[PDB]
Amino acid sequence: SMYAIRKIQFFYGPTDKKSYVGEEAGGRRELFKTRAEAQARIEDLEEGVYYLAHNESGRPDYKIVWVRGE
Amino acid sequence: RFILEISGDLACFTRSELKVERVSYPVITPAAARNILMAILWKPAIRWKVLKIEILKPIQWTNIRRNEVGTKMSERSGSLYIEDNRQQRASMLLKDVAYRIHADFDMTSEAGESDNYVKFAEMFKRRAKKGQYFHQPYLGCREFPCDFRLLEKAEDGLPLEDITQDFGFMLYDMDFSKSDPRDSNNAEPMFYQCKAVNGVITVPP
Amino acid sequence: TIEKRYDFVFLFDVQDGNPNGDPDAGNLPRIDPQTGEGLVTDVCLKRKVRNFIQMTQNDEHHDIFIREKGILNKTEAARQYMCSRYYDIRTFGAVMTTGKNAGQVRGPVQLTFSRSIDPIMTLEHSITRMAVTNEKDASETGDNRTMGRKFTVPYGLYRCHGFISTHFAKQTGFSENDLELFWQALVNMFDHDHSAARGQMNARGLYVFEHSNNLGDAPADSLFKRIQVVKKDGVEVVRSFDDYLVSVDDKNLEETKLLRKLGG
Amino acid sequence: TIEKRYDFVFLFDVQDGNPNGDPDAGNLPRIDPQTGEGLVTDVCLKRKVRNFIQMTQNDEHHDIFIREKGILNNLIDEAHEQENVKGKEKGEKTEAARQYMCSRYYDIRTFGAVMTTGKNAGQVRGPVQLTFSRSIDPIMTLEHSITRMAVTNEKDASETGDNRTMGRKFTVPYGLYRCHGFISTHFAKQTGFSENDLELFWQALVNMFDHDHSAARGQMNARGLYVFEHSNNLGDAPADSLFKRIQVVKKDGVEVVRSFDDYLVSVDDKNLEETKLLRKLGG
Amino acid sequence: TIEKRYDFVFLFDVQDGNPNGDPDAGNLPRIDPQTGEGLVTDVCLKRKVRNFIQMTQNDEHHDIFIREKGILNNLIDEAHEQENVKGKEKGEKTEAARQYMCSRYYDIRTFGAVMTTGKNAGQVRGPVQLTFSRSIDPIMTLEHSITRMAVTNEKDASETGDNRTMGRKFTVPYGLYRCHGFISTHFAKQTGFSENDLELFWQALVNMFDHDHSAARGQMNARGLYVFEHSNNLGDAPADSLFKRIQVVKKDGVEVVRSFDDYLVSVDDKNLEETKLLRKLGG
Amino acid sequence: GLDRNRQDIGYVLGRLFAVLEKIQAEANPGLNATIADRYFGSASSTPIAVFGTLMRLLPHHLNKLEFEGRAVQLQWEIRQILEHCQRFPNHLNLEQQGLFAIGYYHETQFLFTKDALKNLFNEA
């Protein structure tokens, strides 16, 4: 259906929270038809240096997911 | 009557419907002025009454957050260990406020022996001049101390007479009646602020 | 038991490090948005006091009732016992689950936000580390690249205003020796607080105004105005305590209010 | 555990090359924007001490929680499944984990440490906190440039011009750095930082630099270590005076600082007779 | 592996030629603007070492990693098809690459190296390190101008007075230069640096310059090589209390220096003999 | 503008160098070669090396200048400028090294002006 990415973020202190990708801006969460686009998207996020926020434990984990077509 | 002016850097008077995360009023609270007067001189026989309130400088916001605990302490407990309780809280603080007040007072039922109107008025003037009180009046919270100068009329920056916006219905006070000594339980009288041009006028019942 | 109103002014400075990072915008030192100077909320000072007392005395009459795990691990009768047991609870007060009127128990001492004399500027160091946090993806292929952004300030100064109110001390029994303890505390409140984030924070000067009667004689505004602190004219960039000037006026206060120089 | 609170002042200089390089601007040595003085963040010096321990001991009770390449979370888990930690329930489990880890790794005992990632094992403030370090007089950086005589990949045997290979290696000619350090008795009692370990720490700082050499660093060495030893548990007096007793200043003649003999160090011990002891180690 | 730990000082002069020129400032020698002293970046002297080895050894177990014209990724990949083709499964495959590289190329076994371009093969800090080296007393560069008989191209076909563009050459009338070198042990144990390599290295230093003469450099030499030898893996005494015992001073009589007879060399051996050793190599 | 008598060493040395350069320019018209890359690097720290050496050969350039008026005017100008100095310093502080450049460029701007030197000479 609609392929996309699940986003998880681990903070120091056992807590941690979840949100998709594409919730940054006016555009809603972004939708890819093919898993290949999602794989490339994962790669290009993994490419760069990662700048930690405050009270952040380690580099985030992305996993791939297809969401039922909205 | 009496005319007084209050000054200070910071002040919040939290609405009810947002008490969880502070959203202060634009204007001062008619209930608050009562207690501010009572701070200088509390007797068990005096009933205060506020008549006129005057803004002085344009309203101005800032925002802040700090770490809180939300568990009222109880006898059965030993301590709190706040690390297991913290609830970060935000606040909408007014900045750089000075207000002017016209107010008077009357007598309660328990007039007592020394129920002389004149002596209470005189000692109030004395305490206002020398700087005397049970405790420094707040400005809606203990951390914002205020400063009060007893003046006659027009002894500060010219009042900001500019017509300002409405505010709908506003907190007035909290009834003491159905409560015995030490305010067992209370209700909440309201009023209508109705955007006074510059001088907000407190109507009695 | 105390019987006179008290006021005081407190002067303290941060050498290098962050006093109170905002928990809303990353961790930057709090700064007043439209002027460039940096606040320090009172509650931080109150916490440092409570920690000092818990660390120093360690016996009865001097428990704190608001602890931090790191350091260590009819109604009127109970209320009086309790307000006799914990130094903190009788000093700054507390609010009971139930009591005379919603549990309000105030206590004498009060404090206030402590601004800075001059506008202040911040530095954002970028910081790294050896090992990856978790084996998740393990960052094995040299991907441990991560940055930390630790904050700092170069130097400043801070003014704090504090009150007392003896009437509350009546119903809390604030003995004058407790007040002496309080003075000693704020004098030495900093040597027992060192953490990487804050860096070296230091206490400069304490000035105590004492009245004669219970209700006071002179409105405290002038009492504060007597002390003045100014930037030295020559320098345009402040870097130490040497760049400031402190002036005390004891020409008129001697009527019925005494002044001390406990701080220095 | 230890007995008496300590404070101290530390003096070291850089001969040639960059002590700490900002990951925001190449490897420019860290610099104050206004005064023009050089900054060396503490974590660098902490890292150097950790490295010295790594070199010197190679024994249990002295391992270090942070190393060149290791999964922290795996270390926490390993420490987690031991008999004491297994036996207790969750509430006491964190404290047990803290106690075991503090028993094992010298680093966590001395400095601070944070561990809440997987199976949480708490936070420890650690006794020996340590401050920034500043440079006495403003320093200048000599932007050096170098060349390579090969090319990394096979993509270009010959560049558009010559092989670019323009490498930059920054250096600093001189400057005295000072820092201030504290040790706490009460916090020490919690994690068991014992006296002998303090002895090891003093030895470390005295001989810390000789065992850290690199291309970029150049010659470094340490000059001064002055120690104030409080008498009673609580403070004798505020530290600030104790620091202000010793000072360093430029000799009047020079205006381009290029050695130690340019500077002058003076120690104050007249009003010392108070119970605070001054012990000098650096020289 | 070496069972001691070495620190040494080195003294070399230049007669009439540019020792190493700014890759940017035309080609003029590298000088310290504020004090007007000379500079010789370390990589230059190290590269001279590598050239010496290239000429002398020319077999396996002394091949050199950096060459006149080569592809680095090719050298890494070639190592990736040794016996350990995949048997280490990317966990220590990189570590196996490090071991093989350090097994072959004497350059990497001695000085540090970085091999993480393609199929990353590791990093080595390097048991030996060297500092920048600078001039005892200021030097003054004598710019020149020279002329070539014939024109390179035909673009400037016409020959006029302004034609036959001169181009330049730089020289230094004299100088002297101090070098400071450190040898680690604990780092040595990792990459198998052996005693025999050290002997080769001393012979490399003493006889470096005779085997390297170009047009620009002109004559250079080696005035002194002194080695202080520790007696423990632990640093017996700090660096400076060693180095200050070898003091070189301008003689009084001359105001302008022109040759080694002017300078004076003093070696101090008061009591270091008890544990430390001093051996003379330069002379 | 340009200070007549700022009197700090760098500025006067910079003016001197600029004048020498302009002399070299008009002395050899059919040329583009600039003493700039030749001696700014020398001039910053140790003028004592370079200034006198240049002064050795100024007279040749001056004589090779064709027109008498320019030569005598520039002669008087350098006589004016050299009045401020008393001794070639051997080393310069950082601000001196920069102010040397500022002086050079101000002097070049002033010289390239159409007739200012003519007016000043005519006053003389």
Q: Which residues of A touch D118 (CB under 8 A)?
A: 14
Structure tokens at C149: 């952004």
Distance (Å, whole) CA E170 – CA B9: 70
Q: Torsion angle of alpha carbons B106, B108, B112, B115, nearest 10°?
A: 0
Distance (Å, whole) CA A31 – CA A22: 9
DSSP F15-33: HHHHHHHHHHHHHSSS---
**Whether D117 contacts chain A with CB within 8 A:** yes
| Chain D: closest CA distance from residue E161 (Å) | 30
Which residue from F minimizes the CA distance to E170? Answer: F38
Provide the angle, in degrees to the nearest 10, between the axes of the packed helices F47-64 and F9-27: 30
Nearest CA to D51 out of D212, D210, D171 is that of D212
Please state, as a whole number, how many other Cβ atoms lie within 10 Å of the Cβ of residue E29: 22
- What is the helix, strand, coil percentage profile of chain F, to 5? 75, 0, 25
Which of D117, D120, D123, D124 should be substituted to probe chain A, the one whose Cβ sees the most A Cβ atoms within 10 Å? D117
**Is B52 in a helix, a strand, or coil?**
strand
**Which chains are within 8 Å of C by 3+ CB pairs?**
A, B, D, E
Distance (Å, whole) CA E170 – CA E29: 8
Q: Which residues of D touch A58 (CB under 8 A)?
A: 117
Distance (Å, whole) CA F98 – CA F36: 15
Distance (Å, whole) CA E70 – CA E85: 23
Structure tokens at A70: 């909205």
Touch test F–A: 3 Cβ pairs or more under 8 Å = no
DSSP D135-157: ESS------EEEE-SSBSSSS-S
DSSP C87-144: HHHHHT-EEBSSSSSTTEE--S-B-----BSS----EEE----SS-S-SSSTTTTTT-
Count of H-run helices and E-run strands, chain A? 1, 4
Touch test A–B: 3 Cβ pairs or more under 8 Å = no
DSSP E115-159: E-SSS--EEE--SEEE--EEESS----EE-----SS-S-STT-S-
Structure tokens at C40: 């320090």
Q: 126-165 in C: which are within 8 Å (CB) of A?
A: 132-134, 136-137, 139, 143, 145-149
Non-local CB neighbours of C219 within 8 Å, separated by 6+ positions: B130, B131, B147, B149
**Is B196 in a helix, a strand, or coil?**
coil
Structure tokens at D97: 């984990």
**Whether A12 contacts chain D with CB within 8 A:** yes
CB contact under 8 A, A58 and D120: no
Q: Torsion angle of alpha carbons F51, F57, F61, F62, nearest 10°?
A: 80
Which residue from E minimizes the CA distance to C138? Answer: E91
CB D171 within 8 A of CB D140: no
Q: Which contiguous run of DSSP H or E holds residue A64?
A: strand A61-67
Burial class of residue D160 (count of CB atoms within 10 Å of its CB; 0-12, 13-18, 19+): exposed
**Is F37 in a helix, a strand, or coil?**
helix
CB E215 within 8 A of CB E167: no
CB B153 within 8 A of CB B48: no
Distance (Å, whole) CA D150 – CA D171: 24
CB F15 within 8 A of CB F106: yes
Distance (Å, whole) CA D72 – CA D54: 17
Q: 51-70 in A: which are within 8 Å (CB) of D?
A: 57-58
Distance (Å, whole) CA D256 – CA B138: 58
**C63: DSSP letter:** B
Structure tokens at A42: 């994962």
Non-local CB neighbours of B85 within 8 Å, separated by 6+ positions: B69, B70, B71
Distance (Å, whole) CA E209 – CA E195: 23
| Chain A: closest CA distance from residue C71 (Å) | 19
Which of E32, E35, E143, E163 should be substituted to probe chain F, the one whose Cβ sees the most F Cβ atoms within 10 Å? E143
Phi, psi of F90 (to 5 degrees): -95, -25
Q: How wide is the angle at C-alpha B43 spanned by C-alphas B40 and B45, nearest 5°?
A: 140
Which residue from D minimizes the CA distance to C122? Answer: D33
Distance (Å, whole) CA B185 – CA B170: 21
Distance (Å, whole) CA C31 – CA C38: 4
Length of chain D: 283
**Whether A27 contacts chain D with CB within 8 A:** no
CB C111 within 8 A of CB B143: yes
Give me the residues paired with residue D250 across strands: D263
Distance (Å, whole) CA C191 – CA D7: 10
Of F31, F44, F46, nearest to E140 by CB-CB distance is: F46
Looking up tokens 């709190």 gives B80
HSE-CB for D150 with a 13 A CA cutoff: 16
Nearest CA to E94 out of E118, E112, E120, E132 is that of E120
Start-to-end CA span in chain D (Å): 28
- What is the helix, strand, coil percentage profile of chain E, to 5? 25, 20, 55
Nearest CA to E214 out of E58, E10, E11, E27 is that of E27
Q: Which residues of A touch C149 (CB under 8 A)?
A: 51-52
Q: Please give the C-alpha separations between residue C54 and each of C69, C89, C91, C199, E242, in angstroms, as whole numbers.
A: 12, 12, 14, 22, 51
Spell out where chain D has E strands.
Answer: 6-14, 39-40, 113-114, 123-124, 130-135, 144-147, 166-169, 176-183, 220-229, 247-250, 263-266, 277-280
When computed from its CA atoms, the radius of gyration of chain D, rounded to whole angstroms, is 23
**Which chains are within 8 Å of E by 3+ CB pairs?**
C, D, F
CB D133 within 8 A of CB D220: no
Which of C130, C141, C143, C144 should be substituted to probe chain E, the one whose Cβ sees the most E Cβ atoms within 10 Å? C141
Distance (Å, whole) CA D123 – CA D120: 9
**F7: DSSP letter:** -
Q: Which contiguous run of DSSP H or E holds residue B101?
A: strand B86-107
**A54: DSSP letter:** T
Q: Please give the C-alpha separations between residue F27 and each of B181, D239, F20, F70, in angstroms, as whole numbers.
A: 108, 71, 10, 10
Burial class of residue E132 (count of CB atoms within 10 Å of its CB; 0-12, 13-18, 19+): buried
Which residue from A minimizes the CA distance to C137? Answer: A61
Distance (Å, whole) CA B147 – CA C165: 16
Give the type of residue at B188.
E
CB B5 within 8 A of CB B146: no
Q: Please give the C-alpha separations between residue D42 and each of C16, D131, D187, D276, F47, in angstroms, as whole numbers.
A: 11, 6, 20, 27, 43
Distance (Å, whole) CA C16 – CA D3: 28
Which of C200, C202, C235, C242 should be substituted to probe chain D, the one whose Cβ sees the most D Cβ atoms within 10 Å? C200
Spell out where chain F has E strands.
Answer: none
CB contact under 8 A, E33 and F32: no
Which residue from C minimizes the CA distance to B39? Answer: C165
Q: Please give the C-alpha separations between residue D87 and each of D91, D96, D265, E258, F44, in angstroms, as whole numbers.
A: 11, 10, 57, 81, 76
Which residue from C minimizes the CA distance to D77? Answer: C134
- What is the helix, strand, coil percentage profile of chain B, to 5? 15, 30, 55
Distance (Å, whole) CA D40 – CA E266: 36
Touch test E–B: 3 Cβ pairs or more under 8 Å = no
**Whether D1 contacts chain A with CB within 8 A:** no
CB contact under 8 A, A50 and C145: yes
Distance (Å, whole) CA F56 – CA F78: 14
Distance (Å, whole) CA E213 – CA B115: 114
